[PDB]
Amino acid sequence: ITGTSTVGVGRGVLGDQKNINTTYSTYYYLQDNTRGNGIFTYDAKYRTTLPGSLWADADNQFFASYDAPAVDAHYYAGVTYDYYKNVHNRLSYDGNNAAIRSSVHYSQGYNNAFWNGSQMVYGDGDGQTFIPLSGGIDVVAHELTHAVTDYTAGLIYQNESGAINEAISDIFGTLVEFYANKNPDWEIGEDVYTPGISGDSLRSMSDPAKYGDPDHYSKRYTGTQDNGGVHINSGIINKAAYLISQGGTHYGVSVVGIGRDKLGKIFYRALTQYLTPTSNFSQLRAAAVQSATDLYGSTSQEVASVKQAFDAVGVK
Ligand SMILES: Oc1cccc(Br)c1
Ligand SMILES: Oc1cccc(Br)c1
Ligand SMILES: [Ca+2]
Ligand SMILES: [Ca+2]
Ligand SMILES: [Ca+2]
Ligand SMILES: [Ca+2]
Ligand SMILES: [Zn+2]
């Protein structure tokens, strides 16, 4: 809507106070004008009609329990925006400051969050498996990253190209979590998963096998469920990405780590210049090698490390 930019204050899902960019016109709306063409957060009011209504608040203070998932969806969209702009010179997901829209309170006890082709959608969880999913900065940035993947490489959501699509989202979801630098790790969803169990997550990049996902190509899932294993076989690529950044010896293959920022530059370039809708894992390796070549030279350690990492997870 049309109005004046203001700054509200509230608490997120985990109880943390933060400032949020709002817009005043009779009510205060969750409309951030400071980023691109706007960041907009909506109330789906426990239903599945989207987007629902632009979030409106009488007094610019967002401390009610009902408010917390909106606060975090709105704030973490901003953080994700800032990551892509400041780190990769990318202005929103289309590169031309497309509006970022998110709906919270989607359905009842909905244990998921997704990008629907046009906007973000967040369930509140059932309180046992998940709490409201926008509380997870890695979840927010994972799912927002699909918007850019769909706009750039366009990796189809099935079989190996799908698993790459998923790994890309885990990779940048994690790098945004490190960017924000609040309890960062290489695990996915730890801040919103199983409130009664500490130390767990839904997936691990550092050790995919912790939660039954493959960490080697020879262990890939070959079946038809999960669209040919897109959320399973992502572990193979997540492990490769982890090794490129952190190093290690995996199934006897040693990798020299080159750190998170170079990981991010290599995979961003691969995503936006070399991958295609039907890329497979071998093609991902080639794209990552070419990207690292472009950035650091054919003879660099960075290139050697990318090759070692893919060797380590069995991808030729
Ligand atoms: O996928 C993207 C890219 C840039 C900004 C945001 Br928010 C999401
Ligand atoms: O990408 C997502 C969506 C929902 C939960 C988790 Br963990 C990750
Ligand atoms: Ca209020
Ligand atoms: Ca964390
Ligand atoms: Ca995490
Ligand atoms: Ca937990
Ligand atoms: Zn995903």
Curated annotation (Swiss-Prot):
Keyword Protease: yes
Catalysed conversion reaction: Preferential cleavage: Xaa-|-Leu > Xaa-|-Phe
Subcellular location as annotated: Secreted
Active-site residues, as the UniProt record annotates them: 143, 231 (proton donor)
Cofactor requirements of the protein: Ca(2+); Zn(2+)
Annotated thermal dependence: Thermostable.
Keyword RNA-binding applies: no
Residues at which Ca(2+) 4 binds: 193-194, 197, 200
Binding site for Ca(2+) 3: 177, 183, 185, 190
Coiled coil ranges: none
Enzyme Commission number(s) from the entry: 3.4.24.27
UniProt: Ca(2+) 1 binding residues: 57, 59, 61
Cellular component GO terms, alphabetical: extracellular region
Gene Ontology terms describing biological process: proteolysis
GO molecular function: metal ion binding; metalloendopeptidase activity
Record-listed Zn(2+) binding positions: 142, 146, 166
Top-rank EC class of the record's enzyme: hydrolase
UniProt: Ca(2+) 2 binding residues: 138, 177, 185, 187, 190
Keyword list, A-Z: Calcium, Hydrolase, Metal-binding, Metalloprotease, Protease, Secreted, Signal, Zinc, Zymogen
CC cofactor note: Binds 4 Ca(2+) ions per subunit.
Similarity comment: Belongs to the peptidase M4 family.
General function of this protein: Extracellular zinc metalloprotease.
Stated name of the protein: Thermolysin
Residues of the full protein shown: 233 to 548 of 548
